[PDB]
Coordinates of C-alpha atoms in Angstrom, one line a residue:
Chain J
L24 CA 108.5 190.0 191.7
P25 CA 111.7 190.2 194.2
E26 CA 114.6 190.9 191.7
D27 CA 116.7 188.0 191.7
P28 CA 119.9 188.3 189.7
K29 CA 121.9 185.0 190.5
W30 CA 118.3 183.6 188.3
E31 CA 117.4 186.6 185.6
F32 CA 117.5 185.6 182.6
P33 CA 117.5 188.3 179.6
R34 CA 114.4 188.1 177.5
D35 CA 116.2 189.4 174.3
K36 CA 117.9 186.2 174.9
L37 CA 114.7 184.0 174.6
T38 CA 113.1 182.9 172.0
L39 CA 109.8 181.2 172.4
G40 CA 108.7 178.4 169.8
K41 CA 106.7 175.2 169.6
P42 CA 104.4 174.5 172.7
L43 CA 105.3 171.2 174.0
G49 CA 100.1 176.6 183.3
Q50 CA 101.9 176.0 179.5
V51 CA 104.9 175.2 178.6
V52 CA 107.1 175.9 175.5
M53 CA 109.8 175.0 174.0
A54 CA 112.3 177.8 172.8
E55 CA 116.0 179.0 172.3
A56 CA 117.8 180.5 174.7
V57 CA 120.9 182.5 174.1
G58 CA 124.4 182.3 176.5
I59 CA 121.7 180.8 178.8
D60 CA 125.2 178.7 180.5
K61 CA 127.2 181.5 181.1
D62 CA 130.1 179.3 179.8
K63 CA 129.4 179.6 176.1
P64 CA 127.5 183.4 176.2
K65 CA 127.3 182.9 172.6
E66 CA 125.2 179.4 172.2
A67 CA 121.9 179.5 171.9
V68 CA 120.7 176.6 174.0
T69 CA 117.3 174.6 173.5
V70 CA 114.9 174.8 176.4
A71 CA 111.4 174.7 178.0
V72 CA 109.6 177.7 179.4
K73 CA 106.6 177.3 181.4
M74 CA 104.7 180.0 181.7
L75 CA 100.7 181.2 182.5
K76 CA 97.5 181.1 180.2
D77 CA 95.4 183.8 179.1
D78 CA 92.8 182.8 181.6
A79 CA 95.1 182.1 184.2
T80 CA 93.7 183.0 187.9
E81 CA 95.5 184.6 190.8
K82 CA 95.6 181.3 192.0
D83 CA 97.9 179.7 188.6
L84 CA 100.6 182.6 189.5
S85 CA 101.5 181.9 192.7
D86 CA 100.9 178.2 192.4
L87 CA 104.1 179.3 189.0
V88 CA 105.4 181.2 191.9
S89 CA 106.1 178.7 194.0
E90 CA 106.9 175.8 191.9
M91 CA 110.3 177.8 191.0
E92 CA 111.6 179.0 194.1
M93 CA 110.8 175.1 195.2
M94 CA 113.6 174.7 192.0
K95 CA 116.1 177.3 193.1
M96 CA 115.9 175.9 197.0
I97 CA 116.2 172.2 196.0
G98 CA 119.6 171.7 194.4
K99 CA 121.1 169.9 191.6
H100 CA 120.4 166.8 190.9
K101 CA 120.8 164.1 188.0
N102 CA 117.2 162.6 188.3
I103 CA 115.7 166.2 189.1
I104 CA 114.2 168.4 186.4
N105 CA 116.6 171.8 187.0
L106 CA 115.8 175.2 186.5
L107 CA 118.1 177.1 184.2
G108 CA 116.6 180.4 185.0
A109 CA 113.4 182.6 184.6
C110 CA 112.0 186.0 183.5
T111 CA 110.3 187.6 186.6
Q112 CA 111.3 191.0 185.7
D113 CA 108.9 193.4 183.5
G114 CA 106.8 191.0 181.9
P115 CA 104.9 187.7 182.0
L116 CA 106.2 185.1 184.7
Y117 CA 109.3 183.1 182.9
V118 CA 110.1 179.4 184.6
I119 CA 112.9 178.3 182.3
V120 CA 114.0 174.3 182.9
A121 CA 116.0 171.5 181.2
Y122 CA 114.4 169.9 178.1
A123 CA 113.8 166.8 177.9
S124 CA 113.3 165.8 174.3
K125 CA 111.3 162.3 175.1
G126 CA 108.6 163.7 176.9
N127 CA 106.3 162.8 180.2
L128 CA 107.7 159.5 181.2
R129 CA 103.8 158.3 181.0
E130 CA 103.2 159.1 177.4
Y131 CA 107.4 157.5 177.2
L132 CA 106.4 154.5 178.2
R133 CA 102.6 153.9 176.5
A134 CA 104.4 154.5 173.7
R135 CA 107.1 151.7 173.5
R136 CA 104.5 149.2 174.0
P137 CA 104.8 145.8 172.2
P138 CA 103.3 145.7 168.8
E151 CA 109.4 152.1 168.4
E152 CA 112.0 150.5 170.4
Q153 CA 110.5 148.7 173.6
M154 CA 111.4 148.5 177.0
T155 CA 113.4 145.6 179.1
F156 CA 113.0 144.1 182.5
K157 CA 116.2 146.0 183.4
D158 CA 115.3 149.4 181.6
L159 CA 112.3 149.1 183.5
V160 CA 114.1 148.7 186.7
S161 CA 116.8 150.8 186.0
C162 CA 113.6 154.2 185.0
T163 CA 112.7 152.6 189.2
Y164 CA 115.9 153.1 190.8
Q165 CA 117.0 156.6 189.3
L166 CA 113.9 157.6 190.5
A167 CA 114.2 156.0 194.1
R168 CA 117.7 158.1 193.6
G169 CA 115.7 161.5 192.9
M170 CA 113.4 161.2 195.6
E171 CA 115.9 160.1 198.1
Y172 CA 117.5 163.2 197.2
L173 CA 114.4 164.8 197.5
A174 CA 114.1 164.0 200.6
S175 CA 117.5 164.9 202.1
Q176 CA 116.9 168.4 201.3
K177 CA 113.6 168.2 203.5
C178 CA 111.4 168.3 200.2
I179 CA 108.0 166.7 199.8
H180 CA 106.8 166.3 196.5
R181 CA 103.4 165.1 196.9
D182 CA 102.4 164.6 192.8
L183 CA 104.0 161.5 192.0
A184 CA 103.5 160.6 189.2
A185 CA 104.5 159.2 185.7
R186 CA 102.9 162.2 184.1
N187 CA 105.4 163.8 186.2
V188 CA 108.6 162.5 185.2
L189 CA 110.5 163.6 182.6
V190 CA 112.9 161.4 179.8
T191 CA 115.6 163.3 178.0
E192 CA 117.7 162.0 174.8
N193 CA 120.2 159.5 177.0
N194 CA 116.8 158.0 178.7
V195 CA 117.6 160.0 182.0
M196 CA 114.6 160.4 184.2
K197 CA 113.8 163.7 185.3
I198 CA 111.4 164.4 188.1
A199 CA 109.1 167.7 187.6
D200 CA 106.0 169.3 188.1
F201 CA 107.1 171.1 191.2
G202 CA 104.1 173.0 192.0
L203 CA 102.7 170.8 194.9
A204 CA 106.3 170.7 196.4
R205 CA 106.6 171.9 199.6
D206 CA 109.2 171.9 202.8
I207 CA 108.4 169.5 205.5
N208 CA 107.7 172.0 207.2
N209 CA 105.2 174.0 204.9
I210 CA 102.0 172.2 206.0
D211 CA 99.2 172.7 207.8
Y212 CA 99.4 169.5 210.0
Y213 CA 95.7 168.9 210.9
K214 CA 93.5 171.0 208.4
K215 CA 90.6 170.3 206.3
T216 CA 92.1 171.8 203.6
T217 CA 94.8 170.3 203.7
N218 CA 96.3 168.0 200.9
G219 CA 93.0 169.3 198.4
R220 CA 94.1 169.4 195.5
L221 CA 96.5 166.3 195.6
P222 CA 95.5 163.1 192.5
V223 CA 93.6 160.6 195.0
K224 CA 95.2 157.9 193.0
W225 CA 98.8 158.3 193.8
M226 CA 98.2 159.5 196.9
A227 CA 98.7 158.1 200.5
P228 CA 95.6 157.6 202.9
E229 CA 97.1 160.0 206.1
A230 CA 97.3 162.6 203.3
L231 CA 93.9 162.4 203.5
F232 CA 92.1 161.0 206.3
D233 CA 95.2 162.6 208.7
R234 CA 95.3 165.4 207.0
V235 CA 99.5 165.4 207.3
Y236 CA 102.4 164.7 204.9
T237 CA 105.5 163.3 205.3
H238 CA 108.6 161.4 203.8
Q239 CA 106.8 158.2 204.0
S240 CA 103.4 159.7 202.2
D241 CA 105.8 160.8 199.1
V242 CA 106.9 156.9 199.2
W243 CA 103.5 155.5 198.8
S244 CA 102.7 158.0 195.9
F245 CA 106.4 155.8 194.8
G246 CA 104.8 152.5 195.2
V247 CA 101.8 154.0 192.8
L248 CA 104.7 155.5 190.1
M249 CA 106.7 151.7 190.5
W250 CA 103.0 150.1 189.6
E251 CA 102.5 153.1 186.5
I252 CA 106.2 151.6 185.2
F253 CA 105.6 148.2 184.8
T254 CA 102.5 148.2 183.5
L255 CA 104.5 150.3 180.9
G256 CA 102.1 153.4 181.8
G257 CA 98.8 152.0 182.6
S258 CA 96.2 154.1 184.8
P259 CA 96.2 152.8 188.9
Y260 CA 93.6 151.3 190.1
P261 CA 91.5 150.8 186.8
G262 CA 87.7 150.8 186.8
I263 CA 87.8 152.2 190.0
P264 CA 86.1 155.2 190.7
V265 CA 88.1 158.0 192.6
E266 CA 85.0 158.4 195.1
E267 CA 84.9 155.0 195.9
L268 CA 88.5 154.4 196.1
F269 CA 89.8 155.4 199.9
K270 CA 87.0 153.4 201.2
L271 CA 88.7 150.1 199.6
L272 CA 92.1 151.6 200.1
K273 CA 90.4 150.5 204.0
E274 CA 89.5 147.7 203.0
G275 CA 92.8 146.9 202.2
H276 CA 92.1 147.1 198.3
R277 CA 95.7 146.7 196.3
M278 CA 96.7 146.3 192.8
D279 CA 97.6 143.0 191.3
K280 CA 101.1 142.6 190.4
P281 CA 101.6 143.9 187.0
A282 CA 101.8 141.6 183.7
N283 CA 105.5 140.9 183.4
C284 CA 106.7 141.9 187.5
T285 CA 109.1 139.5 188.9
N286 CA 106.8 139.3 192.6
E287 CA 110.0 141.0 194.4
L288 CA 109.3 144.3 192.7
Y289 CA 106.1 143.6 193.5
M290 CA 106.4 142.6 196.8
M291 CA 108.0 146.2 197.1
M292 CA 105.3 148.3 195.6
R293 CA 102.7 146.3 198.5
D294 CA 105.7 147.6 200.8
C295 CA 104.9 151.2 199.8
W296 CA 101.3 150.7 199.9
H297 CA 101.8 149.7 203.8
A298 CA 98.4 151.4 205.7
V299 CA 101.5 152.3 208.6
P300 CA 103.7 155.1 207.2
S301 CA 106.6 154.1 208.7
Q302 CA 106.0 150.4 208.1
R303 CA 106.9 151.0 203.8
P304 CA 110.4 151.7 203.1
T305 CA 112.8 154.7 202.9
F306 CA 113.8 156.0 199.8
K307 CA 117.0 155.2 200.6
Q308 CA 116.3 151.6 201.5
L309 CA 114.0 151.5 197.6
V310 CA 117.6 152.8 196.6
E311 CA 119.5 150.0 197.4
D312 CA 117.3 147.4 197.3
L313 CA 116.4 148.8 193.0
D314 CA 120.3 149.1 193.3
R315 CA 120.2 145.7 194.0
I316 CA 118.3 144.2 191.7
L317 CA 119.2 146.2 188.7
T318 CA 122.5 145.1 188.9
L319 CA 122.1 141.4 189.2
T320 CA 119.8 142.0 186.6
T321 CA 123.0 142.9 184.2
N322 CA 124.7 139.4 185.3
Chain F
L24 CA 76.6 161.1 199.3
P25 CA 73.2 162.2 200.5
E26 CA 70.6 160.5 198.5
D27 CA 68.4 162.8 196.8
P28 CA 65.5 161.1 195.3
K29 CA 64.4 163.8 193.0
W30 CA 67.6 164.1 190.8
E31 CA 68.7 160.6 190.9
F32 CA 69.0 158.4 187.7
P33 CA 69.3 155.1 187.6
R34 CA 72.9 154.0 186.6
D35 CA 71.8 151.1 183.8
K36 CA 69.5 153.6 181.9
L37 CA 72.6 156.1 181.2
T38 CA 74.9 155.3 178.4
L39 CA 78.7 157.3 178.4
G40 CA 79.5 157.9 174.9
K41 CA 82.1 160.0 173.2
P42 CA 84.3 162.3 175.3
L43 CA 82.6 166.4 174.2
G49 CA 86.0 167.7 185.2
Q50 CA 85.5 165.8 182.3
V51 CA 82.3 165.6 180.1
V52 CA 81.4 162.9 177.3
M53 CA 78.6 162.7 175.2
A54 CA 75.7 160.2 176.8
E55 CA 72.4 158.2 175.8
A56 CA 69.9 158.5 179.1
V57 CA 66.6 157.0 178.8
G58 CA 63.3 158.2 180.0
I59 CA 65.6 160.2 181.6
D60 CA 62.6 162.8 180.4
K61 CA 59.5 160.6 182.4
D62 CA 57.1 161.7 180.3
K63 CA 58.9 159.1 178.1
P64 CA 60.0 156.6 179.8
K65 CA 60.9 153.9 177.0
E66 CA 63.2 156.8 175.3
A67 CA 66.6 157.4 175.3
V68 CA 67.3 160.7 175.2
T69 CA 71.2 161.6 174.3
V70 CA 72.7 164.1 176.9
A71 CA 76.0 165.3 179.0
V72 CA 77.3 163.9 181.6
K73 CA 79.9 165.6 183.6
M74 CA 81.8 163.7 185.9
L75 CA 85.4 163.3 187.3
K76 CA 88.8 162.4 185.6
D77 CA 91.4 159.2 186.8
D78 CA 93.7 162.3 188.1
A79 CA 90.6 164.0 190.6
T80 CA 91.8 165.5 193.7
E81 CA 89.9 165.4 196.5
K82 CA 88.6 168.9 195.5
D83 CA 87.6 168.1 192.3
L84 CA 85.3 166.1 193.4
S85 CA 83.7 168.6 196.2
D86 CA 84.0 171.3 193.4
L87 CA 81.5 168.7 190.8
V88 CA 79.3 168.3 193.6
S89 CA 78.5 171.9 194.1
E90 CA 78.4 172.5 190.9
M91 CA 75.3 170.2 190.9
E92 CA 73.5 171.8 194.2
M93 CA 73.6 175.2 191.9
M94 CA 72.2 173.8 189.7
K95 CA 69.7 171.5 191.4
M96 CA 68.9 174.9 193.4
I97 CA 69.4 177.6 190.5
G98 CA 65.9 177.0 188.4
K99 CA 64.7 176.7 185.4
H100 CA 65.2 179.4 182.6
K101 CA 65.9 179.3 179.0
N102 CA 69.1 180.6 178.6
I103 CA 71.2 178.3 181.5
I104 CA 71.9 174.9 180.9
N105 CA 69.5 172.7 182.4
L106 CA 69.6 169.9 185.1
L107 CA 68.1 167.0 183.5
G108 CA 69.4 164.6 186.4
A109 CA 72.6 162.8 188.2
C110 CA 74.1 159.2 189.6
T111 CA 75.3 159.8 192.9
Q112 CA 74.8 156.7 194.8
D113 CA 76.6 153.4 194.6
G114 CA 79.7 154.6 192.1
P115 CA 81.1 157.3 190.5
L116 CA 79.6 161.2 190.6
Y117 CA 77.5 161.9 187.5
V118 CA 76.1 165.2 186.7
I119 CA 73.6 165.2 183.9
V120 CA 73.5 168.5 181.9
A121 CA 71.4 169.0 178.4
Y122 CA 73.4 168.3 175.7
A123 CA 74.4 171.9 173.6
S124 CA 74.8 170.6 170.3
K125 CA 76.6 173.5 169.2
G126 CA 79.6 173.5 171.5
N127 CA 81.1 176.4 173.1
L128 CA 79.8 180.5 172.4
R129 CA 83.9 180.8 171.9
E130 CA 84.6 177.8 169.1
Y131 CA 81.0 178.3 168.0
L132 CA 81.9 182.0 167.5
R133 CA 85.6 181.7 166.0
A134 CA 84.0 178.9 163.4
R135 CA 81.7 181.1 161.9
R136 CA 84.3 184.1 160.7
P137 CA 84.3 185.1 157.7
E151 CA 80.9 178.1 159.1
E152 CA 77.9 180.6 158.3
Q153 CA 78.7 184.3 158.9
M154 CA 77.1 185.5 162.4
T155 CA 74.8 188.9 161.3
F156 CA 75.2 192.2 163.5
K157 CA 71.6 191.1 164.8
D158 CA 73.1 187.5 165.3
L159 CA 75.0 189.1 167.8
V160 CA 73.1 191.1 169.2
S161 CA 70.4 188.2 169.4
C162 CA 73.4 185.8 171.0
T163 CA 74.2 189.0 173.6
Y164 CA 70.2 189.7 174.7
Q165 CA 69.7 185.9 175.3
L166 CA 73.4 186.0 177.9
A167 CA 72.1 188.8 179.4
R168 CA 68.4 187.4 180.2
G169 CA 70.0 184.2 181.1
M170 CA 72.8 186.1 184.0
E171 CA 69.1 188.8 184.8
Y172 CA 67.3 185.5 185.6
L173 CA 70.6 184.3 187.7
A174 CA 70.7 187.4 189.6
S175 CA 67.5 187.1 190.6
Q176 CA 67.9 183.3 192.3
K177 CA 70.6 185.8 194.1
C178 CA 73.1 183.7 192.8
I179 CA 76.9 184.8 191.3
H180 CA 78.5 183.1 187.8
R181 CA 82.1 183.9 188.6
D182 CA 83.0 182.7 185.4
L183 CA 81.1 184.3 183.1
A184 CA 83.1 184.1 179.5
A185 CA 82.1 182.4 175.8
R186 CA 83.9 179.8 176.4
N187 CA 82.0 178.4 179.2
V188 CA 78.8 179.3 177.4
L189 CA 77.5 176.4 175.1
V190 CA 75.0 176.6 172.1
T191 CA 72.2 174.6 171.2
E192 CA 71.2 173.1 167.8
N193 CA 68.7 176.0 167.6
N194 CA 71.5 178.7 168.5
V195 CA 70.1 179.0 171.7
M196 CA 72.3 180.8 173.9
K197 CA 72.7 178.2 177.5
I198 CA 75.1 179.5 180.4
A199 CA 77.5 176.7 181.9
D200 CA 80.0 175.8 183.9
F201 CA 78.6 176.4 187.7
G202 CA 81.8 175.3 188.9
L203 CA 82.8 178.1 191.1
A204 CA 79.2 179.5 191.3
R205 CA 78.0 180.7 194.7
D206 CA 74.9 182.0 196.4
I207 CA 75.5 186.0 196.7
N208 CA 76.3 185.7 201.1
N209 CA 78.3 182.1 200.2
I210 CA 81.5 184.8 200.0
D211 CA 84.2 184.9 202.4
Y212 CA 84.2 188.9 202.3
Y213 CA 88.0 190.3 202.5
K214 CA 89.9 186.8 203.1
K215 CA 93.5 186.9 201.2
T216 CA 92.3 183.7 199.8
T217 CA 88.6 185.0 198.2
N218 CA 88.4 184.9 194.1
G219 CA 91.7 182.9 193.7
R220 CA 90.7 180.6 191.3
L221 CA 88.9 183.4 189.0
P222 CA 90.3 184.2 185.2
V223 CA 91.7 187.7 186.1
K224 CA 91.0 188.7 182.4
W225 CA 87.2 188.4 182.8
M226 CA 87.3 189.1 186.1
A227 CA 86.1 192.3 188.3
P228 CA 89.0 194.6 190.2
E229 CA 87.3 194.2 193.1
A230 CA 86.7 191.0 193.3
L231 CA 90.3 190.8 193.6
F232 CA 91.2 194.3 195.6
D233 CA 88.4 193.9 198.1
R234 CA 88.1 189.9 197.8
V235 CA 84.0 190.4 197.2
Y236 CA 82.1 189.6 194.9
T237 CA 78.7 191.2 194.2
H238 CA 76.1 190.7 191.1
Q239 CA 78.4 193.6 189.4
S240 CA 80.9 191.9 189.5
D241 CA 79.7 189.8 186.8
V242 CA 78.3 192.7 184.9
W243 CA 82.0 193.2 184.5
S244 CA 82.7 189.5 183.5
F245 CA 79.4 190.0 180.9
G246 CA 81.2 193.1 179.4
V247 CA 84.1 191.0 178.9
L248 CA 81.6 188.4 177.4
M249 CA 80.5 191.0 175.3
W250 CA 83.7 191.8 174.0
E251 CA 83.9 188.4 173.0
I252 CA 80.6 188.0 171.6
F253 CA 81.6 191.6 168.7
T254 CA 85.0 190.2 168.5
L255 CA 83.5 186.8 167.1
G256 CA 85.9 184.4 169.7
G257 CA 88.2 187.3 170.5
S258 CA 90.7 187.1 173.3
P259 CA 90.7 189.7 175.8
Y260 CA 93.3 192.2 176.5
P261 CA 95.6 190.5 173.7
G262 CA 98.8 191.2 173.7
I263 CA 98.9 192.0 177.4
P264 CA 99.7 189.4 180.3
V265 CA 97.9 188.4 182.7
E266 CA 100.3 189.7 185.0
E267 CA 100.4 192.9 184.3
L268 CA 96.7 193.3 183.1
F269 CA 95.4 194.7 187.4
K270 CA 97.6 197.4 187.2
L271 CA 96.7 199.1 183.8
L272 CA 93.3 198.1 185.3
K273 CA 93.5 200.2 187.7
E274 CA 95.0 203.1 185.9
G275 CA 91.9 202.9 183.8
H276 CA 92.9 201.1 180.9
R277 CA 90.0 199.5 179.3
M278 CA 89.8 197.2 175.4
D279 CA 88.6 199.3 172.6
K280 CA 86.0 198.9 170.7
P281 CA 85.2 195.6 168.5
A282 CA 85.6 196.6 165.1
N283 CA 82.0 195.4 163.6
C284 CA 80.9 196.8 166.7
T285 CA 78.1 200.0 166.7
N286 CA 79.4 202.7 169.5
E287 CA 76.0 202.2 171.4
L288 CA 77.3 198.9 172.3
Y289 CA 80.7 199.3 172.9
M290 CA 79.6 202.3 175.3
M291 CA 77.8 199.4 177.5
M292 CA 80.3 197.4 177.4
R293 CA 82.9 200.6 179.4
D294 CA 79.4 200.8 182.0
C295 CA 80.1 196.9 182.1
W296 CA 83.9 198.0 183.1
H297 CA 83.1 201.1 185.2
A298 CA 85.5 200.8 188.3
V299 CA 82.7 201.7 190.6
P300 CA 80.3 199.0 190.9
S301 CA 76.9 200.2 191.9
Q302 CA 77.9 202.7 189.0
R303 CA 77.9 199.6 186.1
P304 CA 74.3 199.0 185.2
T305 CA 72.3 196.0 186.4
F306 CA 71.4 192.8 184.2
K307 CA 67.7 193.7 184.2
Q308 CA 68.5 197.3 182.8
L309 CA 71.6 195.6 180.3
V310 CA 68.2 193.1 179.2
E311 CA 65.6 196.1 178.6
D312 CA 68.7 198.6 176.8
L313 CA 69.1 195.5 174.8
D314 CA 66.0 194.2 174.1
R315 CA 65.7 198.2 173.1
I316 CA 68.4 198.0 170.9
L317 CA 67.1 194.2 169.0
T318 CA 64.2 195.3 168.6
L319 CA 65.1 198.5 166.5
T320 CA 68.0 196.1 164.3
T321 CA 64.8 193.7 163.1

């Protein structure tokens, strides 16, 4: 691996620990160049023993994407990496509350339940992360509750960029394109036309939204993967989650528009959500 | 998905259960056509809720492979499948004792393994691979975790998700063999982008090392990232503790750098047969 000084982190400064590809917790001393002696708790992603060549290159891509994206409030951020003489170590910010799916399912009505606002806030936050990601010419392609981390202060952090690509890094029209994307969150164009764009990410965003308001339910319950796309073409769409306003549900439905350009843009989702959230507070 | 009558199984007769790609235990009624009203406990492989397109093509390929391979005492066997109107269910015999790796780590000094057991366990698998080799099929993912053991401690090779017909390999293309766990993988599979029955013999060698270490993890301490450079420089695992020099020499043969210089499964069988009869 090419030596990238700015990101490189001393292995002797890194203390591995409990597990959380493969991710583990760890103490990174002085990782923050503004407290050279302070041991910071971080999360380290690495290869498992049964790793394959593709696994390695996927982890290397995930890391490089994290370098290109830049910093943002709603995006899990890279703290550094151990890429010389030894196992590849991608060191990122540690989210104590774990992933969003486990998180939501965790506080379901009999923990500390989630208010309507808390849900709306969660959605608004992720829309910002994506709105940003899109301004960075980056497509995630793997948006889902399980790929969102939640901090101690309940800040939503989008993670798992193993599949994220630059808008131009996609072989439009080839059969192999989009073959590794979980279908229940995947936009039809991704498969039928073998293309992927920001609008494809909004479709996924719609499913993530449905996941949030169902407090972590599983999309298209009872519907097999092998039969989904047929139904999706026949027009099928998930039902308005339990306690979910018809407004937020129509928002989801819009994300699930068959015509990619008729779906809202992340910028638009952000403004609507910002409106809903604000009026909720008042 | 094509309608293949010979293997199809009525969904109503199937009853999924506790979990064991994704595998779950199940009750298949009259899956054994000689006992139309007897319900047989079987294992069912299906896709997961977060499945991807490739996952499906992969499961489908797994099934077809088993269809073409045929039956053999040391290969887990396909019992039938639900391929029409609904999820894809690949039904296979149920190995009551789990995967060889767990099985072995379990009885570590819960009733210990004797040398002869290890030798037998080895021989059974060698017969499995010899048969596979004769069916012109490369496994590509041979490893203790991928071997199931039935109630009668019979060894059954399983996990055919990456197995291809010898001729169905994209010789020399960069992407070839990019999904095979490197620590069981043969050098050439990566350095020349090819795969032959001889690559499988290498994996088998690693399998042998697993068996005799009673479930050890290959190349302990050596990270995947720096394995292939060591392999190139001639690095090879040391003799497992409770393993005969003879058996270890056999492992090293399986790990000869030159593929044509590694034993064939037929030979592996014969020697193992010879060593085993003597242990008995």
